Design a binder for this molecule. Structure first.
Ligand SMILES: O=c1cc(-c2ccc(O)cc2)oc2cc(O)cc(O)c12
Ligand SMILES: [Zn+2]
Lengths: 47, 162
C-alpha cells in the first residue's frame, strides 16, 4: 500500500474523456472506509 | 464482532440504497467484457453491517482527517466490489484489499458508478467470471458488493484519460 500524495488524504480519479463516467476514488488507509451495506444482487439480461 | 441486519424492501433505508445502485449503472467501454452486459440489477438482499470496533476505528480516523481539513471529513457513500467482501465485513479494509497495480497507486478503490465496482466482484477485470459457470456476464449467480462510508478529506484531483 502506497502513501497519499503529501498533504492529501485520498485521490480523486476524475474521467476527462468519457463525459458520462462518474469519479473513482482511492484511499491509502483502511480506517478511512466503513463497509456499511452489503448488497446481494444479479445483473439482468437486457430485453 | 460483525452482525448483519436484513433491511425490509419496505424500509426507506432499503429503497434509498437500491436507488443509488440502480441509478448509477452506466455503459462501459469494454462492452461488458469485465462485468457483463446489463442496464439494471435484480436486488436480492440489502444488509446493514454492524461492527462496533470497526465503526469506532472509522470515526476516530474521520475526526483526525476532519481536523486536518477545515473541519471537513469530505465523507461520501461509494461502491466497492471485491472477491474478498466476506473478509472485509468481518475484519475491515486493509492492505490485502489494495489494488496494487491500479491507476492511481497502490490503494483501496471506490466508485460512484455501481457498474464500475461490479467489474471487480469476480476479481481484476472480472477475473474468470462467476465460480460456477466461469461467466463474467452470468445472469444466474448471486453477486455481492459493498456500499461504503468513505472519508476523502483533502482529495488530490487527478484528471484521467478515462
Ligand atoms: O470497487 C473496486 C474494487 C477494486 C478492487 C481492485 C483490486 C482488488 O484486488 C480488489 C478490489 O478496484 C476498483 C478499481 C476502480 O477503478 C474502481 C472500483 O470501484 C474498484
Ligand atoms: Zn454463474
Amino acid at each position: 500500500m502506497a502513501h497519499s500524495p503529501p498533504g492529501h488524504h485520498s485521490v480523486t480519479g476524475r474521467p476527462s474523456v468519457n463525459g458520462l463516467a462518474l469519479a473513482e476514488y482511492v484511499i491509502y488507509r483502511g480506517e478511512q472506509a466503513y463497509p456499511e451495506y452489503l448488497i446481494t444482487y444479479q445483473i439482468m439480461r437486457p430485453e | 464482532g460483525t452482525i448483519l441486519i436484513d433491511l425490509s424492501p419496505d424500509d426507506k433505508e432499503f429503497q434509498s440504497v437500491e436507488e443509488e445502485m440502480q441509478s448509477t449503472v452506466r455503459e462501459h467501454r469494454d462492452g461488458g467484457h469485465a462485468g457483463g452486459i446489463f442496464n439494471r440489477y435484480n436486488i436480492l438482499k440489502i444488509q446493514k453491517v454492524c461492527n462496533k470496533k470497526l465503526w469506532e476505528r472509522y470515526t476516530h480516523r474521520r475526526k483526525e482527517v476532519s481536523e486536518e481539513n477545515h473541519n471537513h471529513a469530505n465523507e461520501r457513500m461509494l461502491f466497492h466490489g471485491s472477491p474478498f467482501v466476506n473478509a472485509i465485513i468481518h475484519k475491515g479494509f486493509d492492505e490485502r484489499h489494495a489494488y496494487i497495480g491500479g491507476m492511481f497507486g497502490a490503494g483501496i478503490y471506490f466508485a460512484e458508478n455501481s457498474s464500475k465496482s461490479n467489474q471487480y466482484v469476480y476479481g481484476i477485470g472480472g477475473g474468470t467470471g462467476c465460480p460456477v459457470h466461469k461467466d463474467r456476464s452470468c445472469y444466474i449467480c448471486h453477486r455481492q458488493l459493498l456500499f461504503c462510508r468513505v472519508t476523502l478529506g483533502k482529495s488530490f484531483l487527478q484528471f484521467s484519460a478515462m
